[PDB]
Amino acid sequence: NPSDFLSRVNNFSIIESTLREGEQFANAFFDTEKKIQIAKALDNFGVDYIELTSPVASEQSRQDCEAICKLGLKCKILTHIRCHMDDARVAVETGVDGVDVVIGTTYIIDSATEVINFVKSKGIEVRFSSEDSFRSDLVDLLSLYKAVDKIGVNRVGIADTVGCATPRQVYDLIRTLRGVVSCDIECHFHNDTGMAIANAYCALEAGATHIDTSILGIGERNGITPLGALLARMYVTDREYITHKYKLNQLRELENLVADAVEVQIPFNNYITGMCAFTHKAGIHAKAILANPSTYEILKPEDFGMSRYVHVGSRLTGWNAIKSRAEQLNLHLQAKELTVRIKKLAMDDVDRVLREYHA
Amino acid sequence: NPSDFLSRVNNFSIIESTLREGEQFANAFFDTEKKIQIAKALDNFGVDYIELTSPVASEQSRQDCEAICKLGLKCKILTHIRCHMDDARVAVETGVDGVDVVIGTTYIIDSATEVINFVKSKGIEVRFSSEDSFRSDLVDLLSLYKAVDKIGVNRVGIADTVGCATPRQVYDLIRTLRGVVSCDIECHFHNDTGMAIANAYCALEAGATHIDTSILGIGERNGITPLGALLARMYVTDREYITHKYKLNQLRELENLVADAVEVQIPFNNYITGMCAFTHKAGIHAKAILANPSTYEILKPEDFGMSRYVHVGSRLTGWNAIKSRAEQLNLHLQAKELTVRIKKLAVRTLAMDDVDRVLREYHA
Ligand SMILES: [Co+2]
Ligand SMILES: [Co+2]
Ligand SMILES: [Mg+2]
Ligand SMILES: [Mg+2]
């Protein structure tokens, strides 16, 4: 199939947006110190880019943008702006590697031209994006990308800001964009209807080169493509590429860092790192399928820093529950006041209570 | 455009599988009474079918199947079996409306013929399904469905048992199957790689007629297409169809019933009913986008029994947190009992997802 030649499923970059999209999470109020811990951990994890809330947003955003650019991280630091010269002047002086010029759908082209050429004159990477791309007029959108491509820009951006796009619709649009522009393509997908990971997958199949993620998917409403969930999907597609590019065994600690800051639990069903992600039912309930449960193990626990699937025969209560999960997570334990805590206190409590501990 | 004629996005049936797939959830140990509560609530909610664990699985499974069939529910009660006569004999006597004959990939066709014709001779709906369909040889699978279609079955089934299938691969396969068989098509998608909802969507676009779900997605590993998530997606596609077919304002109670039984929290990010599903960030963080946050409201709270999006400007702590969520949920508050159990959680440091947890005991 000729179209497989364009697929970027084993050759793409993550733009990690916990410090942009994630700031829109209902309970996210990151201070400078926490953002710095997150940026460092994300860099250690191996993402190519980190995106930050516009330095125009507030005085604290300008300062944090500047501080993060002074860290000497390996990943590139990106931010975004409105299509406006004053915004651009602020962004360029902050030390960022890249600026996204964002519009929402003539006088757009001439204004965008000024902004784009200014940023390029500073030696800074420039991108041009549309907001709510899937509820915009398609021909006007494509004509705008076409013109901006001729001006010369590093990347164009597509965003399903509303969460309404479906996978085949995403594939078709990105595949057309790939034929319209000569540059890289960044994508952003909201998860309101459960499509955020699928939409990311199909975008990559269609030739997109950069995907926005967020740790635990946190963001506006129910958020965007989750970091861990994208990697699980991409890992099944190309195990060797993903296992060697990212430090997958650091994913639990990365999520725990964010979950503590935004005061949430890790959901039981959470991709890879949820309580139940690496579990099989043993016993009479397993006869709801024909093959032995261990036939169905698309994810290998050891690739993600864990030791086994847990085969559940009966309800795990007390220190039996704690011990089983602790051993699956390769925690070496301390064991005293965990079973003493759990008794004076549910299933997701097991992970809650174990959050402190490292493998 | 001609392909749109085959699409079932606004004309499909849900096969609710909380009482089959859901039993494979690591922490699910439903007794007869709990299964009966779940079956009744599912029927009231408006699903067309519920599927139960094979009555062959154990003595109690046989008994619960019988008991659920005696309830007089409106939805049809389905179960599944191995491609074996003894299984079929047991299943038919239970009172079920439908039996799924499941195989995993010439003697298949002979055995399957006997079992299919037996079930049909009892006046019971028969379906024929493959397990792990997306890791099977395509030509053999399609040839098998073709043969079973000629014998005559009510439905054929496709299952991504391993969670590896991708949306376009699903579309392509279902669309081929739709041209191979003349009967209805039931689907089943695991969520290991985050595709279970997308896969259901594309299956329906391609002509599938029946989709398995489970409440909160619960099942083997991280489970299958979640009931609420499918309905959110299908609601955006056709609001009038979904809001009138299902009792969407009952979804929280339905999930709360299962969450209590399998002892989990409702995830903060859960579709529709999660803490944060109907929230916008107000303040300087909203400038991470161009438009007012209220521009992006694909889901309308009132359709799901809720009162508004919560616009968060600052950390909602204490009674402010409780009041905000309680009013969003349309609970009419009892604030002296909810003051008496957070004083008992001083036991530990209290955090965001506990708001929904302490509010579970309350109805709209
Ligand atoms: Co967004
Ligand atoms: Co299954
Ligand atoms: Mg972007
Ligand atoms: Mg089925």
From Swiss-Prot, chain A:
Effect of residue 296 to F: Results in a decrease in catalytic efficiency
Effect of residue 296 to A: Abolishes the catalytic activity
Effect of residue 328 to R: Does not affect the catalytic activity but impairs L-lysine inhibition
Gene Ontology BP annotations: lysine biosynthetic process; lysine biosynthetic process via aminoadipic acid
Catalytic center residues: 285
UniProt xrefs under InterPro entries: 2-IPM_HCS-like, AIPM/Hcit_synth_CS, Aldolase_TIM, DRE_TIM_HCS_fun_bact, Homocitrate_synth, LeuA/HCS_post-cat, PYR_CT
Effect of residue 100 to N: Does not affect the catalytic activity but impairs L-lysine inhibition
Cofactor: Mg(2+); Mn(2+); Zn(2+); Co(2+)
GO MF annotation list: homocitrate synthase activity; metal ion binding
Subcellular location: Mitochondrion
GO CC annotations, alphabetized: cytosol; mitochondrial matrix; nucleus
Pathway noted in the entry: Amino-acid biosynthesis; L-lysine biosynthesis via AAA pathway; L-alpha-aminoadipate from 2-oxoglutarate: step 1/5
Binding site for Zn(2+): 21, 188, 190
Record-listed L-lysine binding positions: 21, 100, 161
Phenotype upon changing residue 80 to A: Substantially impairs catalytic efficiency
Variant or mutagenesis effect after changing residue 20 to A/K/Q: Abolishes the catalytic activity
Record's catalysed reaction(s): acetyl-CoA + 2-oxoglutarate + H2O = (2R)-homocitrate + CoA + H(+)
EC numbers on record: 2.3.3.14
Classification via Pfam families: HCS_D2, HMGL-like
Impact after mutating residue 51 to A: Abolishes the catalytic activity
Alphabetically ordered keywords of this record: Amino-acid biosynthesis, Lysine biosynthesis, Magnesium, Manganese, Metal-binding, Mitochondrion, Transferase, Transit peptide
Domain Pyruvate carboxyltransferase: 12-252
Recorded family membership: Belongs to the alpha-IPM synthase/homocitrate synthase family. Homocitrate synthase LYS20/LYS21 subfamily.
Function: Catalyzes the aldol-type condensation of 2-oxoglutarate with acetyl-CoA to yield homocitrate, the first step of the alpha-aminoadipate (AAA) lysine biosynthesis pathway.
Name of the molecule in the record: Homocitrate synthase, mitochondrial
Native organism taxonomy: Eukaryota, Fungi, Dikarya, Ascomycota, Taphrinomycotina
